[PDB]
Each structure stands twice: as structure tokens, then as C-alpha cells.
Design a protein around this ligand. Structure first.
Ligand SMILES: *[C@@H]1O[C@H](CO)[C@@H](O[C@@H]2O[C@H](CO)[C@@H](O)[C@H](O)[C@H]2NC(C)=O)[C@H](O)[C@H]1NC(C)=O
Ligand SMILES: *[C@@H]1O[C@H](CO)[C@@H](O[C@@H]2O[C@H](CO)[C@@H](O)[C@H](O)[C@H]2NC(C)=O)[C@H](O)[C@H]1NC(C)=O
Ligand SMILES: *[C@@H]1O[C@H](CO)[C@@H](O)[C@H](O)[C@H]1NC(C)=O
Ligand SMILES: *[C@@H]1O[C@H](CO)[C@@H](O)[C@H](O)[C@H]1NC(C)=O
Ligand SMILES: *[C@@H]1O[C@H](CO)[C@@H](O)[C@H](O)[C@H]1NC(C)=O
Ligand SMILES: *[C@@H]1O[C@H](CO)[C@@H](O)[C@H](O)[C@H]1NC(C)=O
Ligand SMILES: *[C@@H]1O[C@H](CO)[C@@H](O)[C@H](O)[C@H]1NC(C)=O
Lengths: 1017, 188, 49, 49
């Protein structure tokens, strides 16, 4: 017994495909399944819907195969044998052998050749010979391939596909298969099972990889995502249900047979105008004998299939019978017009019964005419359904009013049928009876009722699944059923014992798979949603999962969360920042095993609060941060008529009847294209002049070489822009889909951003509110320092340090972008989502929508107009909904880029053209300046900010009393180092002596709380 | 319930949100506006109030000389919030109006399973028990086309309604950065 | 629990793999909304006793 | 062209209402657009389809 080692794939069809990850749903060999092994023995082996036959030998031993269904001297089977130079195929009838064999020449396996049909003599641990057979669809297909092997252990790794060789159009059955060689040579036999695969075609068109969909959960995630590598995260794979155990059927006792014979075998029948009706109730009727009782001339009945009539229960059977004249039968049907249909007997359109008719010439044929049967003639109005008219008085039809007489304008209402034995079948009589459709039930049984397992039921007429537990919802002494909110079927009353149960369907849920990533490892964990996994292990959750899934459905580690229960992960106590979310504050990660824990919000910190304590920084740092925002998306135009008709003159005219649904889509698609140019203009084109940086570079030690354009490259783009362009690359033709080019190129956006940079460097904030006025850069930095509350002499005394920090900060952005390939993620999602929407709109053109074919050429050139409009119209309905869905989703998605484009316009005006005083709008810390950069479909902002450091604690007081007066600071605070008092600014430590010019006086020192004593110079 | 309708739990529970709010309150009480830009620096509360008075153009001797009055006014002002929230139950009308709209859309989806668009019945176990296979496919195809339209209208309105909530969440995050982590000079 | 359904529904294309992707996107979005409002302080602070 | 923005709101809200009324004069794959000729030329059982 040896399992499969990834072997046994073939080419399902003769169609060439390259570089496509196609999916198939054909019979295949399940992966990792054991096969039988044989080696001087060769017994019988059943065929059983497929074979993976393979024999390995270094010498020519295997000769041929013989098949069959019964292996007798009567059965038809093949006699495939191999000659010295040719091959022989013969599927005929011959003589079988109890122990056939085949050592130079042996002839003891056959002695008959009678009734032979097909002959097809044609060309034909060291070597593997693997063959695959199958018999289906009135055909028998043979596939094979061979390859040398250098191994002495077993079948090697990898696989190679199989190709067709021949075909044999035959109709036969086969239930046995035995080989015949020349101690016996080894070989294997495996069977085939329906499955679903996913194969890969290389460039040349050869299958080199395939995966299953029911082996392990990771394979299911691969199938759902349609790829061969899955990244980190949690994915939703499939659903989950329970299967029932058995069925219960319960019918009333009722033991008596319906009076069918007295209705069908009545000697005397009434008239059509005075049809008699008979009521049937509380009986058991078998309709099988009803059809077989006699040969009826017409049984075509509506609403119920006659085969299923034996398994339905009704409330009443209103039978009625009458007699008409020959061809008048055609009026006995709903929606018909005629004398019988109008003035005699009307069938309502909601009729749900059956009609049975037959002739009997040898029952009512008298010579000279049978005048006992009469039928109504000209009347006033139309008879309502199921209404009988019994009046036979003379009716007046004319202007002259007559009273009780006849003659002119007054005639006897009825008329005598001319039933004569020599009359034609058109005027011959006819016998008909109509059945119109709990009391009447058919034959059945009654199995004892179960109480704790969810099973099928057929209580009275309702079919369904669910559990049956006792119900304590008191019923009134006459009710039968019960229904809860939203009209859901519920508690039912048992016909045998007066009892009320409950109905609740078997449990269902959803399955998700957590994967660390195939690049790292392979093991996975599985989560069942909103299910208390007390039923999963064995006896309940076995409907679609192979036994390999059992280890992932039960085991040693099972942990119950609020989102369900997790199988395959262990529970720890300590908590970290979490990576993969699950829900209810539980996350999972990889520790190399899978770890599930609780989230941690952050670290701990207790600020030392006191009545008279303060903290003031003594140093600072300069920081730079990034920010990415999208501005625009790709223009797309789709042609109306080309998509749904495809250059067919027989389709265009059938579309004009629908109206203006076709020209209302192009306008909507043009609106977005118009908007995604104003989006860019609002953001980048807001300076009216082009500025240039001076040739020399003396900016006080600051170095702007990494954001300014370079003259040693044709692109005229900054190195940061080069990296951004190379990181992200800037949906097929045919079928009337086009892409329009943007109005502004990239070499123009580069010019705009260079102009903005030159303006902010050489002028400041002046060029955005009038004419541009020049100013040296360190003076501008002094002005910007004064805007956050720090005096300007701080900058001038620490110029070199600030310049060095600025230069070092800008040199780490390149690394922080080129070392993290997941940084420009916001701009990749807009590109990815647009391609997915356009990829589905082209796959929807290969769908039938309920038609013979999905191509308009085959339908047209296989049929004529009057019955081709029905098939075409069913394709213009489904192909128009696919376009309506696409346009609506794009209108919503474009309202999200407009919101992001409008925000980017605010940032450029308030962060690049000025200094902002709001918080977190323009980065962390205190804002100093900002610089713009260009992206393929967006913008990038680099912010420069101010952050304190190196704090120290002092002692403070709100005021000072001296000579009976209270002294207050002008702009500062009062601090002490333990012996002396000073005055300093709030964002930087720089002590000074308290005097008059930095202090104002108001009031005496007997009101404020916390005043201290000191001296003022 | 049932019929393929599930509700998933949020990632953050209520306790964690309570901890976040408590941390923000502690930071704003014991440290001022400093912790929103760097390391937290302590400062006594009346001095923080004196700082905040300077931002609106009032000199700081006004606060110190009337501390016991501002304290009483602040304490009395908060105590009236409970008496106004407890009464007038229509105060939280912006939060009930979003719970109702979602639940009014799940009812119309389930209630539409009781329609029988141009067919014999509304339940699929009766057209499959009273009819032959070749005929019981025109009736089944009519029910499918109606249930797909009902499930398509539901998704479109959820997309439009979701875009409206994202606008409010983007506004609230601005008020937390600008009116809680610092002082604001914008009007209203 | 009806196979005639699953055999008849396949002919309409992919009109409920598109409906199961919009709702997941909506559900995922109502987690950045809560994170963008409350989670903006790194540490946890405690009021003095 | 000074008051361009406000004029486009009026025009868009009037083009849409015109298209809706004009769509009442299309067959959609039937014999006639008016209901009083469908009934007055066909009998009910197949006039309903
Ligand atoms: C203020 O911080 C700066 C850091 O930005 C300090 O400058 C560094 O000083 C160390 C000496 O201890 C040098 O090794 C570094 O090279 C300096 N940094 C740079 C960028 O040159 C500065 O000394 C600090 N000042 C005080 C008073 O502590
Ligand atoms: C607190 O600061 C005062 C500043 O006035 C320090 O007092 C001076 O300390 C220097 C250092 O020896 C002396 O030369 C001066 O004579 C002191 N007085 C003045 C008026 O400058 C004081 O030492 C500091 N206290 C501590 C603990 O460092
Ligand atoms: C009428 O009589 C015949 C006699 O052979 C019988 O076979 C048939 O079943 C009877 N009809 C009914 C409806 O039972
Ligand atoms: C048959 O009659 C008995 C008598 O009480 C009772 O069980 C019930 O009415 C009938 N059984 C059924 C309907 O299964
Ligand atoms: C400062 O606060 C502390 C804390 O209780 C206490 O000594 C007193 O309330 C205040 N002291 C002075 C001198 O104001
Ligand atoms: C600015 O930095 C770049 C990158 O290190 C360097 O090549 C250039 O020489 C610097 N500028 C000056 C004026 O040295
Ligand atoms: C300041 O000096 C006055 C005058 O003696 C005294 O009354 C007051 O208590 C002193 N204040 C402090 C804080 O020592």
C-alpha cells in the first residue's frame, strides 16, 4: 500500500492556453490516497470509473490488457495486445479463459472470434510506464506518457502531465480489468473520484503545477484567492452545516377506498349543460390503478405531475362528469373560447386538477341518431367558472319581443346532438370526467417519531429539516400550526398523539483560516464563527471535510473566545501589541507555533503632580515626517453597443426598443473623466509664475540637494522623486474599452513642484499673498522660531547644530522608503481596485444567462428569426445589468478621491504657503515648514517640526510680594533652584534676574494664595 | 434571524475605550497641552488656567484674584449636565437615528422572502414536490431573478450610508486633536 | 438545501462573489474609524491618589 | 459665465426629470406602449404576459 506522491494529472481538453491559472471540475485522482500493490500473482481487479495504471520494469514483460463486465463467452470487451512491431485493438466477442496467460508464444486465452466489430491495427526501477484509462460519455479515452527514472526506492517527486492517444466510439459496460505479462512484474492500481483542481499553464502551454480543494485548509484558501502564494492575514474560506440522519413519514390512519368505479363505470351519464358533480372525502385513493384501469384517449393535466400524485394530500376532490361532441374537447382547458367553453362549462385559469377523456362508440350508438344528449346554444352573457345553467325556457334573440312562443327571433335554447354510429370521429360522442383539487391521502407508512436528532420530516405535507423537541407554547383547542416573527414555520401538532413539538434547523456557521504566510511557514489555525464547538469533532461536522481535517477540527488545544472557538493555537497570559485581529480584544501572531493572546493598549506612566512643581526642557531636536495622499485615478471609456451586441446588425435593432438606457451611461462615464483633471489642477497649479533657484548655494549650512532637481539626468527629477517613481509602476483592450491620456504630463508636475520649492526657499511666505520679497534663510528660520514662542537669539547661538540636525534628518528618508516595501501602500490600493473591477466585466461575457450558447454567432447561424429573438433577448437582459453595476460602483468610488483631493489642496496652502497653528494637522510637534513632492497619482509631504528634550524640575510660585505690592511676570514663569529665584521663558530654560522691566505690579499681597517673598531690582 | 444573516463583534470592547478616555483626561489634567507634542511636563492646574486666560486676551491677575469664584462657577456648571441629560430623552437623537435605519433595512430584506413574483408559490419545497423536473424550472428561474434584485438594492444603500458615517468620524478626529489636545482660535 | 438551485444559479456569473466583497470592505472600514479617534496617545496616564 | 456653479444644479435636475417621462413611450419588448390597446386586442390568458 503506497499513497500518491503528486502524480496523475492530464490535459482535459485540446485547447491551447498559456500563462493562465485555469480551474477545472473534472474527474481526477484524489491526492495522497493509498493504492493496491501486486507482484507470481495476477487476480481480477474491478475497473470502477477510472484507473491510474503504472508498471515499472527494466525488461519487456507486460504485454496487454483485457476488460469486461461479466467475463463470460457472451460479453463484449477489448483485447488490446502488443505485437513485435505493431499494436492490435479489438473490442469484440470471443472465448474467455479461467486462467488466461501468455515464454515465446502462448495461445490458450481465446478460441472464438464471432460477432466482431472494431479492429484498429495501427502504429504502437529504470523506466516508469504510467497509463490512465476512463470510460464515460459513450467513449473510452486512453492517456499515457513515459520518462526514464534514476532511482531504486519508489516513484519520484514532481509530476508530468498526460496526453490523449486514441478514441473508441463504443457503447458498453465494464466491471473487471486484468493485465497479462509475457516473480510477476510489479504494478499499481488506483481509482478516480470527482474533485476540483486548479492547474498552472507555463508559457509554452505545459501543465507544471496543480492543487486540490479538499485536502487541507490552506489548499482551500489558495483556491478561494486563486493564487499560489498567500500573504499574512485572516481569510474567509467556506461555510459549514450538518447533515441529517434519517427521514420520518406520518400519515393519518384512514382505511377505505374511494368510490372511483361508480363515477367512471356509471351506465348513465348526464348532459354537458346539466353536468352532475360528486363529492369525495375521507378516503385513500391510488391514482396508479386509476391510469391503468382503461386506455384513455387524452390525459394532459395541469398543476401537478401525475408521477408525484401518489405522495400528496388534499382537502377535497370535486369531481364532475359530462358528455360533449368530438372535437369539442379542445375547449376543456383554461384560456379557451368555444361553445362548450362559453355557454356550458368554464375552466378557471387557476385550475389545479386533471382531466380524463375517452371515447366509447360501443356504448351510446343507436341507428338514426342518439337524441338524448343536448347542448346549449346562443345565450346572453358568458358563464362564470364552475357555474351550471339549468333553464331550458325559450329565449328571445331579436327586436321583436315574444312571450313563451318560438318561430322568428325566438328559438328553443338547446339543440339535439346527432350521435350516429356511422358518423365520423369529428362528430362522434366522447366520455369525459374532470377532477378538481387534509382528507384524501395516498398510501404510505408511519415510522416512529424521533426526539433528539435533526432529521427530515414529512409530517402532513410539509418537507424540511431540523430538530424536534417538545414545545410548551400552549395551543388553543383548535389550532394546528404556529409561526413566529417574520413568518417562520414553527411548532406543529402530531396527527397521532395530540402533542406539539418544536422545529429548529441544524446548526450552521462560517469558517476562517489564519495564515502566517507561505513565505515563512505552512501551519494554519481555523476559527468557527458563533458556534460552541461541542459538536464539531466527529459526529456533526462531517459533511464536506476529509478525515485530514479532523486534526484541525478537534485535538488537544481548543480555546473558546467570544467570536467562536479556535482550533490549532495555544493560549498565553502575557499581552503584546497584536498583529492579526480576530475580535473581542483577541489577536494572533507567530512565535515559531501560533499564539493567541489579549491586546495591550500601551505602556504605563504616572506623572508626578504636586502643588508647586514644574518641568522645563533644556534642549531640542528637529524631526522630519512623511505623508502620502492620492489625487487622481485612471480615465476609462466603455462603448455601449459594442459590449452588448458586438457588430451584429440583428442585435442593434432589438436594443433600440429599450430606450435611453444606453446613452445615459456614456455621460456618467464622461463626468468622472472631466473631474479627474480639475482634481489635479486644484492641487498643483496654484502659483502663477515660475521661479528659479540661484546658481550658487550659500544658505547658511543647510543642504537642499536631495529635494532639488539635478542637471546630471534627463529626467530632471529629484532623487527622492526617482525612488518614488521606481517604487510604484504607473483592464484589456477589445470589446469597446479604452483609456484616455491625462491632460498634464509628469514633466509639468515636476516643474510646478520645483517652482513651489524655489519660491518657499528664496522668499518665505510672501509669494503667496502678493509680490515675492527676498530674505536670507536664517532670518526666516528666526521668524519661524518666534512663531512658536521661542526667542530668536536661541537660533543664532546654535546655528551649526540646527543645520547639522536638519541635514542628518533629511538623509534618513531615503532609507526609510527604500528599506520598507510596504510604505507606498495607499497609492497601490487605488491601482489594484480599478483593475479588479475591469477584470470581472470581461469575464461576464462568457455566461449563458439561460441560453443555448454565450456567443451570438452560433445562435444566429443555427436558427431562424422567429425563435431566435427569445434566446437573444435573454442575453441583452443579463449583459445590461453587468454594465449598470460597474457604473454605479465607480460613481461612489470617485466621491472618495474628491474628498482626498480637496484635503490635499488645504495642506498645500496652509503648510507650504504659511505656518499653521493647529495641532496634528501638519505633523507631530510644533510646525516649522513643509516641502512638496510628486508621486505617480498623488502627493508626498515632508514636514519639519520642533520637539523638546532633556527636562528638569523646579519650584514655582504665582507672584512675589515686595514693599507691600504683588509682582507678576510679563512673559515667563518664576522658578527656583532651591536658594534663589529667577524668571524664564516657558519653552526653553534661560534664567534671568527679576527686575522692574520684566514685571508689572497690581494690588497688594494679601489676596493671592501662594505668594512668596523676595527682592526686585 | 437565520437565512444567512450574521452579526460580527467589534475588535475593541467598551472597557478599552473607557481606558483610552481616562488616559486622555489624566493627561489633560496633570500635564496641560504638552503631552500632545512631546514628553509630558507637570504644571499646577491654576497656572494652566492662567495660561489659558492669556490666550483669549485677558491678563493673568484676573484669575488669581477671583479664583474662589471661578472654581464655584465651574463646579456648578458641571452639576447641571446630569439634570439635563437625564430629562429630555430626545437629547441623544443623533445616535438612535442610526441604529433605527440599519434595523429597518434588515426587516425589509427578510419580509421579501414571502413574495411569489409571477410564480405558483413562495416556498421552494412546493414547486419541487408538485411538479416534474422539466416544468419546475421556469417557476424556479422567476424566483431567483427577484431575490437577486432584492439583495442588490440592499448593498447599494449600505455603501451610500457608510460613506456618510466616515465623514463624521473624520470630523470627530479633528475635534479631538484641536479642541482637546490644545486650544483653538477658530470661531464656533 | 437545494441542488437545483446551485445548478441554476451558476449560469448568472459571479453576482455573489461581488456582493460578499463589498460587505467585507464595509465591515473592515468600521475599525479604522474607531482607531482614528481614540488611539492617538501612546502611553497610559494615572491620576494621583 | 460668472454664476456657472448655480446654473448647473438647475440644469442637471431638469434633464433627469425629462428623461424619466420620455421613458414612458417605449415597448421594452412588447406589442404596444399604451395599455388600452394591449387589452382591447388580446384576451386575458396571454394578454397578461
Ligand atoms: C543638545 O542635544 C544635542 C543633540 O541634538 C547635543 O549635541 C550632541 O552632543 C554630543 C556630545 O554629547 C555629540 O557627540 C553629538 O555629535 C552632538 N550632536 C550633533 C548633531 O552634533 C547637545 O550636546 C545637547 N546640548 C546639551 C547642553 O545637552
Ligand atoms: C542656584 O543658583 C544661584 C544663582 O544665583 C547660585 O548662587 C551662585 O552660585 C555661584 C556658584 O558658586 C556663586 O559663585 C555665586 O556667588 C552664587 N550667588 C549668586 C548671586 O550668583 C546657587 O549656588 C544655585 N544653587 C545650587 C544648589 O546650585
Ligand atoms: C371499472 O370497471 C373495470 C372492470 O374491469 C375496472 O377494471 C375499473 O377499475 C373500474 N373503474 C374504476 C374507476 O375503478
Ligand atoms: C389513528 O387513530 C388513533 C386513535 O386515537 C390516533 O393515534 C390517531 O388519531 C390516528 N393516528 C395517526 C393520525 O397517526
Ligand atoms: C499645596 O498643595 C498641597 C497638597 O495638599 C498642600 O500642602 C496645600 O494644599 C498647598 N500648600 C500651600 C502652601 O499652598
Ligand atoms: C548635500 O548632500 C549631498 C548628499 O550627501 C552631497 O552630495 C552634497 O555635496 C551636499 N552639499 C554640499 C554643498 O556639500
Ligand atoms: C513676607 O513678609 C511679611 C512681612 O513680615 C510676612 O508677613 C509674610 O508672612 C512673609 N511671607 C512669607 C511667605 O514668608
Amino acid at each position: 500500500y503506497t499513497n500518491s506522491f503528486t502524480r496523475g494529472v492530464y490535459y482535459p481538453d485540446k485547447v491551447f492556453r498559456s500563462s493562465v491559472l485555469h480551474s477545472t471540475q473534472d474527474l481526477f485522482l484524489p491526492f495522497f490516497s493509498n493504492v493496491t500493490w501486486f507482484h507470481f500473482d495476477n487476480p481480477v481487479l474491478p475497473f470502477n470509473d477510472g484507473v491510474y495504471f503504472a508498471s515499472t520494469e527494466k525488461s519487456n514483460i507486460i504485454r496487454g490488457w483485457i476488460f469486461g463486465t461479466t467475463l463470460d463467452s457472451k460479453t463484449q470487451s477489448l483485447l488490446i495486445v502488443n505485437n513485435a512491431t505493431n499494436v492490435v485493438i479489438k473490442v469484440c466477442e470471443f472465448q474467455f479463459c479461467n486462467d488466461p496467460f501468455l515464454m515465446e508464444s502462448e495461445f490458450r486465452v481465446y478460441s472464438s472470434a464471432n460477432n466482431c466489430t472494431f479492429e484498429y491495427v495501427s502504429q504502437p526501477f529504470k523506466n516508469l510506464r504510467e497509463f490512465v484509462f476512463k470510460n464515460i460519455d459513450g467513449y473510452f479515452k486512453i492517456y499515457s506518457k513515459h520518462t526514464p527514472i534514476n532511482l531504486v526506492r519508489d516513484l519520484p517527486q514532481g509530476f508530468s502531465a498526460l496526453e490523449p492517444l486514441v478514441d473508441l466510439p463504443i457503447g458498453i459496460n465494464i466491471t473487471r480489468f486484468q493485465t497479462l505479462l509475457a516473480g510477476a512484474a510489479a504494478y499499481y492500481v488506483g481509482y478516480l473520484q470527482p474533485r476540483t483542481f486548479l492547474l498552472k499553464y507555463n508559457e509554452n502551454g505545459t501543465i507544471t503545477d496543480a492543487v486540490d480543494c479538499a485536502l487541507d485548509p490552506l489548499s482551500e484558501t489558495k483556491c478561494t484567492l486563486k493564487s499560489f502564494t498567500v500573504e499574512k492575514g485572516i481569510y474567509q474560506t467556506s461555510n459549514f452545516r450538518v447533515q441529517p440522519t434519517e427521514s420520518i413519514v406520518r400519515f393519518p390512519n384512514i382505511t377505505n377506498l374511494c368510490p372511483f368505479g361508480e363515477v367512471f363505470n356509471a351506465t348513465r351519464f348526464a348532459s354537458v349543460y346539466a353536468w352532475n358533480r360528486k363529492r369525495i372525502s375521507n378516503c385513500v385513493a391510488d391514482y396508479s390503478v386509476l391510469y391503468n384501469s382503461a386506455s384513455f384517449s387524452t390525459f394532459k393535466c395541469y398543476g401537478v405531475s401525475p408521477t408525484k400524485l401518489n405522495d400528496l394530500c388534499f382537502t377535497n376532490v370535486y369531481a364532475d362528469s359530462f358528455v360533449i361532441r368530438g372535437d369539442e374537447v379542445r375547449q376543456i382547458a383554461p384560456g379557451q373560447t368555444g361553445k362548450i367553453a362559453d355557454y356550458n362549462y368554464k375552466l378557471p385559469d387557476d385550475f389545479t386538477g386533471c382531466v380524463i377523456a375517452w371515447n366509447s362508440n360501443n356504448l351510446d350508438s343507436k341507428v338514426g341518431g342518439n337524441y338524448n344528449y343536448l347542448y346549449r346554444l346562443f345565450r346572453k352573457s358568458n358563464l362564470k367558472p364552475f357555474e351550471r345553467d339549468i333553464s331550458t325556457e325559450i329565449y328571445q334573440a331579436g327586436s321583436t319581443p315574444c312571450n313563451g312562443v318560438e318561430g322568428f327571433n325566438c328559438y328553443f335554447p338547446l339543440q339535439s346532438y346527432g350521435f350516429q354510429p356511422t358518423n365520423g370521429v369529428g362528430y362522434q360522442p366522447y366520455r369525459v370526467v374532470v377532477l378538481s383539487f387534509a382528507t384524501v391521502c395516498g398510501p404510505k407508512k408511519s415510522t416512529n417519531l424521533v426526539k433528539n436528532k435533526c432529521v427530515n420530516f414529512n409530517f402532513n405535507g410539509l418537507t424540511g429539516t431540523g430538530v424536534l423537541t417538545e414545545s410548551n407554547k400552549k395551543f388553543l383547542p383548535f389550532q394546528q400550526f404556529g409561526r413566529d416573527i417574520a413568518d417562520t414555520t414553527d411548532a406543529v401538532r402530531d396527527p397521532q398523539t395530540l402533542e406539539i413539538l418544536d422545529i429548529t434547523p441544524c446548526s450552521f456557521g462560517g469558517v476562517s483560516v489564519i495564515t502566517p504566510g507561505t513565505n515563512t511557514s505552512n501551519q494554519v489555525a481555523v476559527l468557527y464563527q458563533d458556534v460552541n464547538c461541542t459538536e464539531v469533532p466527529v459526529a456533526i461536522h462531517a459533511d464536506q471535510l476529509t478525515p485530514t481535517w479532523r486534526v484541525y477540527s478537534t485535538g488537544s488545544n481548543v480555546f473558546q473566545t467570544r467570536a467562536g472557538c479556535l482550533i490549532g493555537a495555544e493560549h498565553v497570559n502575557n499581552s503584546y501589541e497584536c498583529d492579526i485581529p480576530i475580535g473581542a480584544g483577541i489577536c494572533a501572531s507567530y512565535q515559531t507555533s501560533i499564539i493567541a493572546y489579549t491586546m495591550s493598549l500601551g505602556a504605563e506612566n504616572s506623572v508626578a503632580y504636586s502643588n508647586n512643581s514644574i518641568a522645563i526642557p533644556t534642549n531640542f531636536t528637529i524631526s522630519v515626517t512623511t505623508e502620502i495622499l492620492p489625487v487622481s485615478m485612471t480615465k476609462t471609456s466603455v462603448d455601449c453597443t459594442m459590449y452588448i451586441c458586438g457588430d451584429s446588425t440583428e442585435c442593434s435593432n432589438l436594443l433600440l426598443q429599450y430606450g435611453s438606457f444606453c446613452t445615459q451611461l456614456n455621460r456618467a462615464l464622461t463626468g468622472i473623466a472631466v473631474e479627474q483633471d480639475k482634481n489635479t489642477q486644484e492641487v498643483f497649479a496654484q502659483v502663477k509664475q515660475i521661479y528659479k533657484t540661484p546658481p550658487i548655494k550659500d544658505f547658511g549650512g543647510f543642504n537642499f540637494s536631495q529635494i532639488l532637481p539635478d542637471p546630471s539626468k534627463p529626467s530632471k527629477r529629484s532623487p527622492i522623486e526617482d525612488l518614488l517613481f521606481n517604487k510604484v509602476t504607473l483592464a484589456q483592450k477589445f470589446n469597446g474599452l479604452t483609456v484616455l491620456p491625462p491632460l498634464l504630463t509628469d514633466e509639468m508636475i515636476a516643474q510646478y513642484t520645483s517652482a513651489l520649492l524655489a519660491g518657499t526657499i528664496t522668499s518665505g511666505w510672501t509669494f503667496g499673498a502678493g509680490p515675492a520679497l527676498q530674505i536670507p534663510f536664517p532670518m526666516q528660520m528666526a521668524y519661524r522660531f518666534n512663531g512658536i514662542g521661542v526667542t530668536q537669539n536661541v537660533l543664532y547661538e546654535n546655528q551649526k547644530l540646527i543645520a547639522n540636525q536638519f541635514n542628518s534628518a533629511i538623509g534618513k528618508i531615503q532609507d526609510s522608503l527604500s528599506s520598507t516595501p510596504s510604505a507606498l501602500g495607499k497609492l497601490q490600493d487605488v491601482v489594484n481596485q480599478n483593475a479588479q473591477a475591469l477584470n470581472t466585466l470581461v469575464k461576464q461575457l462568457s455566461s449563458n444567462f439561460g441560453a443555448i450558447s454565450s456567443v451570438l454567432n452560433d445562435i444566429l447561424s443555427r436558427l431562424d428569426p422567429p425563435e431566435a429573438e427569445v434566446q437573444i433577448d435573454r442575453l441583452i437582459t443579463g449583459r445590461l445589468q453587468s454594465l449598470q453595476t460597474y457604473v454605479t460602483q465607480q460613481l461612489i468610488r470617485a466621491a472618495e478621491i474628491r474628498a482626498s483631493a480637496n484635503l490635499a489642496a488645504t495642506k498645500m496652502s496652509e503648510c507650504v504657503l504659511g505656518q499653521s497653528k493647529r495641532v496634528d494637522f501638519c505633523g507631530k510637534g510644533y510646525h516649522l515648514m513643509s516641502f512638496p513632492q510628486s508621486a505617480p497619482h498623488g502627493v508626498v509631504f515632508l514636514h519639519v517640526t520642533y520637539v523638546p528634550a532633556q527636562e528638569k524640575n523646579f519650584t514655582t510660585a504665582p507672584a512675589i510680594c515686595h514693599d507691600g505690592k504683588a509682582h507678576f511676570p510679563r512673559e515667563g514663569v518664576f522658578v527656583s533652584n532651591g536658594t534663589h529665584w529667577f524668571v524664564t521663558q516657558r519653552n526653553f530654560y534661560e534664567p534671568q534676574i527679576i527686575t522692574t522691566d520684566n514685571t508689572f505690579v497690581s494690588g497688594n499681597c494679601d489676596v493671592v494664595i501662594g505668594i512668596v517673598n523676595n527682592t526686585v531690582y
